[PDB]
Design a protein around this nucleic acid. Structure first.
Ligand SMILES: Nc1ccn([C@H]2C[C@H](O)[C@@H](COP(=O)(O)OP(=O)(O)OP(=O)(O)O)O2)c(=O)n1
Ligand SMILES: [Ca+2]
Ligand SMILES: [Ca+2]
Length: 342
DNA sequence: GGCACTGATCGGC
DNA sequence: CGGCCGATCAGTGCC
């Protein structure tokens, strides 16, 4: 297998730079304004100039503004980013035997047959891909080329920004022998340190432990994954991804535990959700509340039949009542998630 | 036991 | 201090 992984650089901010090139080369922060105050919200992403000043995705807008007050702060325009994404994925698709769109800004291509199993031709294809995306959309991307998805991602991550990372079939074992634990996709900061605390600093160190031992430290899924990766026995296929849930969640103007105050927000979320569902009919509904202290509480139900929009309204209220019954905290955000489509 | 399914949390992008 | 989403996993019912 020859895999090409593509990950768009500083995606949302970069699109904003394409639409407003005056922003380029200066700190730019794309913000998710919740509307509760002039500046309440979180950072979706920042360009590299803003990152140099300490701005990070997920950080409160007010905190970004504290450390980089002269950056340009713009509101997230997600539909435009989706459009860019859709066009790019369409360009990628024509170069691939198979494509896996993993998120709004990354995809895996299986180009094995496209390049006659010739790994070097795979690299050339990767260069052509980067060139085309740059020419056609003025977007820089980072690419990784490797025998499997996971190494393709790791080497891309190591080559950002605007990179072209490569791991040849012959380099894989050396590469896996030297890889740091915190460089592994799917191993978050906390767990990394926990493993680190137990003397697991490098991927190869996993081989020292056995499954029952590691499960206690990582959980089943993460244990099986790590033991496989460490042995270069990861080889998962490129698969067409299918949307499994669709939802909407909004910040209320003020916190509340007043049913009549919350309902309008919840019903708008349902309405916008059903618009997005289009012809998909969900059998499961979950109501999700972000509480005063930014904890998240969910109550849901699966039905033996598809849920009409009208049944979603009435059942959502019963779920909201359940949350209010079982959690005394005030609610800040309220929303809904639909899944199990017919 | 272990399969099928569930509701709820977790955490990455 | 946003707004999403898929993965994960412990609990139940069952044969
Ligand atoms: N907490 C986050 C993280 C990311 N995103 C969105 C904005 C990002 O641009 C996009 C892609 O996420 P990445 O992790 O790939 O990061 P970037 O593309 O922004 O930067 P990088 O160049 O490091 O890949 O997802 C978001 O809305 N909220
Ligand atoms: Ca990405
Ligand atoms: Ca990216």
């Amino acid at each position: 297998m020859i895999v090409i992984f593509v990950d768009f650089d500083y995606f949302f901010a970069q699109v904003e730079e394409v639409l407003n090139p005056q922003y380029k080369g200066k700190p730019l922060v794309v913000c998710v304004y919740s509307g509760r105050t002039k500046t309440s919200g979180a950072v979706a992403t920042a360009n590299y100039e803003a990152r140099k000043l300490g701005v990070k995705a997920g950080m409160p807008i007010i905190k970004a503004m504290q450390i980089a007050p002269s950056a340009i702060y713009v509101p997230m325009r997600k539909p435009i980013y989706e459009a860019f994404s859709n066009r790019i994925m369409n360009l990628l698709n024509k170069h691939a035997d198979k494509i896996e769109v993993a998120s709004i800004d990354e995809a895996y291509l299986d180009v094995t047959n496209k390049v006659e199993g010739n790994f070097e031709n795979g690299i050339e294809l990767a260069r052509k891909i980067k060139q085309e995306i740059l020419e056609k959309e003025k977007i820089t991307v980072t690419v990784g080329v490797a025998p499997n998805k996971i190494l393709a991602k790791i080497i891309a991550d190591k080559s950002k920004p605007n990179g072209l990372g490569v791991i040849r079939p012959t380099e894989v074992q050396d590469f896996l022998n030297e890889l740091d634990i915190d460089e592994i996709p799917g191993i978050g900061s906390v767990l990394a340190r926990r493993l680190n605390e137990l003397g697991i600093q490098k991927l190869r160190d996993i081989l020292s432990k056995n499954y029952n031992e590691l499960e206690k430290i990582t959980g089943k899924a993460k244990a099986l994954y790590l033991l496989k990766l460490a042995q270069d026995e990861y080889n998962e296929p490129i698969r067409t991804r299918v949307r499994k849930s669709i939802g909407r969640i909004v910040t209320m103007k003020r916190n509340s535990r007043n049913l009549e105050e919350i309902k309008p927000y919840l019903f708008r979320a349902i309405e916008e959700s059903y618009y997005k569902l289009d012809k998909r009919i969900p059998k499961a509904i979950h109501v999700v509340a972000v509480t005063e202290d930014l904890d998240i509480v969910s109550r849901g139900r699966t039905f033996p039949h598809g849920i009409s929009k009208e049944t979603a309204y009435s059942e959502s209220v019963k779920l909201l009542q359940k949350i209010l019954e079982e959690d005394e905290r005030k609610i800040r955000r309220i929303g809904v998630r639909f899944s199990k489509f017919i």
